[PDB]
Amino acid sequence: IATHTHIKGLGLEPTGIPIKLAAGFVGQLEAREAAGLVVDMIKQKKMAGKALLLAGPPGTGKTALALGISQELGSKVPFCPMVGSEVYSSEVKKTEVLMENFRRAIGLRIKVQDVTLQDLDAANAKLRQEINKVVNRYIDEGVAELVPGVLFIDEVHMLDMECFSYLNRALESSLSPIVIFATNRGVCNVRGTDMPSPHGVPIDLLDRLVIIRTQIYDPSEMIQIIAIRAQVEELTVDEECLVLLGEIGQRTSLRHAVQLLSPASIVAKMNGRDNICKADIEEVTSLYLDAKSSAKLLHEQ
Amino acid sequence: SKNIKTPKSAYEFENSWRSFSGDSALRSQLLKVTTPSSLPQIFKNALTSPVLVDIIKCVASFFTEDMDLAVKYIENLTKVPRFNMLVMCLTSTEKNELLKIWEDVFCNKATPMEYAEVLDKLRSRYCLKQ
């Protein structure tokens, strides 16, 4: 989460409505209000047995929304991001890494030292049910407390049918954290089978998902985002270059207009000026292409 | 009306023949609801000698009704596969009764020479008396 260090929280009023600019979040009012409602649902344990899905385009603040939810849950609540491609591995079974990340998000505090549940298995190991039983005895005795973290899983369609089914049964456990899937595809066959399904998820897991929409940004909001990332990286910018950066973010993605800020500062330093100018953004945009445009130029030429 | 429909296949023809087997009336009118041109497409070697004798005798039932269609139907029966072995497969009883039907029905004085010549030309190669 090196790229969302500015996300302090959802930025909600006492009444639950989001503020237009607060806690690092600028825009995206519907999804922020929905995330606030879901946070209130986690706080009183009404989401036990369900999970969250963020359905929206790329560079739409889904990972920022999950980080805001995890920050809003508590002070040092853990946040485990991962990708579906990470589940496949040559050295460990896919199910094993799935439970590894799943249990890594279950934080506990013992009266005061804080540690994640997967560290207990890593030290004591496979034998996870016994670890669950002893931490249940600990928290029932009151000497320790549990905090459910946030297991964020981007590219949910990449997960296999075995992965989806195992997550469906594994959500039944009382100690489990909130699992936040994220997707941008829609129609996609479930990996490992030929049946189409919404968002590449089977029906048996889609039964228990609470969906939230995230909407694309207008240019002004995107320019505000690039400005916020400019201040957080200790860079200096102006409207003449920020407008071009916003156009570049619109035409490719906000994840490629926020990656270009640092080399713009570097090429500005090579040009002998400490402040980024429009020529710097033109130069770095000419040099470094996005993945889609780069592949397009590769296959066309 | 709905009981007597066009068969699409030899399966359909044989299953219509089985149901209508005991009653000749729904067999003599069965051949009217089907085109003889489609007959070599309907039968794709699924035609046994008893069925051949039955169909020829059924065409004899309404020979005089539509004589051209009869001499078309028998002619179209020549276009089925495995016809030569089929007429070679006839037993002596069917051979004799086909000769009787030839002298009675298909070579009577009522028919004109135009259909009679074609019927006798086909019957030279059906019976194969020698």
């Binding site: 009444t15 639950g16 519907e30 209000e33 929905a34 409602l37 209130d40 649902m41 009183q44 009404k46 369900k50 359905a55 929206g56 385009p57 199910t95 049918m161 075995e162 989806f164 089914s165 195992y166 049964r169 997707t183 941008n184 595809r185 829609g186 129609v187 030929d194 049946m195 919404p198 968002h199 029906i203 048996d204 889609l206 039964d207 228990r208 998902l209 609470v210 969906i211 939230i212 929409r213 694309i216 | -």
Partner: protein, 281 residues
């Protein structure tokens, strides 16, 4: 579900008179239409003492043990010795390996100890949920296991019409071989009607300590009819906390409108995602 429950009752009478033999039951229909409720209802209606086992789906092909071992353990789970099941006897005598001595010993015991309350046996209702995922290997094992004496009453569930058999190329109804399908009493579950949706939402309101007026109830019944029952059930909790944020005593129609605006359903989000992906990519 009235027709499906009546069919379950007729099958239960077939079980009680023993006329069912070398036969299984299938519960078809759209997903989430209370199929497991029918299965457990039949199992309890035979008797609470009789065992039950819901094992199957994609749960098989993911456990540490092989598919045949899991199927054997679940099959032995659904044979109650009175209560203790045969699988419990296997765990006491211990996955590891399954010993064949137990069948000989319990055959001798039921031959000797019966009508004493020691080693009588009742057959349970096995339930193989989401059977279309099972391989042709699993169906062959099912055929070999059903023909054995003192077998459980097999029940299977499916929510797909015609699929490829898992492990072969040839298609079949319900993803089951024809030799199985020529023995299955297929119960079909109809979709829920308006009076069923309203009653289910009222039961969930009573369970979760949520009060809401009749306008909200009728609009939520309409939403559940149009969209989904589980979506409406999620809306109950979400609107309850939305009204709690306003310090209200009773959930109102504005809470349902707000939460329906916020939390999308599967179909609406599917529409809003394809409307991005088809044009912008």
């Amino acid at each position: 579900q009235v027709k499906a429950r009546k069919a379950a009752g007729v099958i239960l009478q077939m079980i009680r008179e023993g006329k069912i033999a070398g036969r299984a039951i299938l519960i078809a229909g759209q997903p989430g239409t209370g199929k497991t409720a029918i299965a457990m209802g039949m199992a309890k209606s035979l008797g609470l003492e009789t065992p039950f086992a819901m094992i199957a789906g994609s749960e098989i092909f993911s456990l540490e043990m092989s598919k045949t071992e899991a199927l054997t353990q679940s099959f032995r789970k659904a044979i109650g010795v009175r209560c203790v099941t045969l699988h419990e006897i296997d765990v006491i005598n211990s996955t590891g390996e399954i010993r064949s001595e137990v069948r000989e010993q319990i055959d001798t015991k039921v031959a000797e100890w019966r009508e004493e309350g020691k080693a009588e046996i009742v057959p349970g209702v096995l339930f193989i949920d989401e059977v279309h995922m099972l391989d042709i290997e699993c169906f062959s094992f099912l055929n070999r296991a059903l023909e054995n004496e003192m077998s459980p009453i097999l029940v299977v569930a499916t929510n797909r019409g015609v699929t490829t058999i898992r492990g072969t190329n040839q298609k079949s109804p319900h993803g089951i071989p024809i030799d199985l399908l020529d023995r299955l009493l297929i119960i079909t579950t109809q979709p829920y009607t308006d009076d069923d949706i309203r009653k289910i939402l009222e039961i969930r309101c009573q369970e979760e300590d949520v009060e809401m007026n009749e306008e909200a109830k009728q609009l939520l019944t309409l939403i559940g009819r149009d969209t989904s029952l589980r979506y409406a059930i999620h809306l109950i909790t979400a609107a309850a906390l939305s009204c709690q944020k306003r310090k209200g005593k009773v959930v109102e129609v504005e809470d349902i409108q707000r939460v329906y605006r916020l939390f999308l359903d599967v179909r609406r989000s599917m529409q809003y995602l394809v409307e991005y992906q088809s044009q912008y990519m």
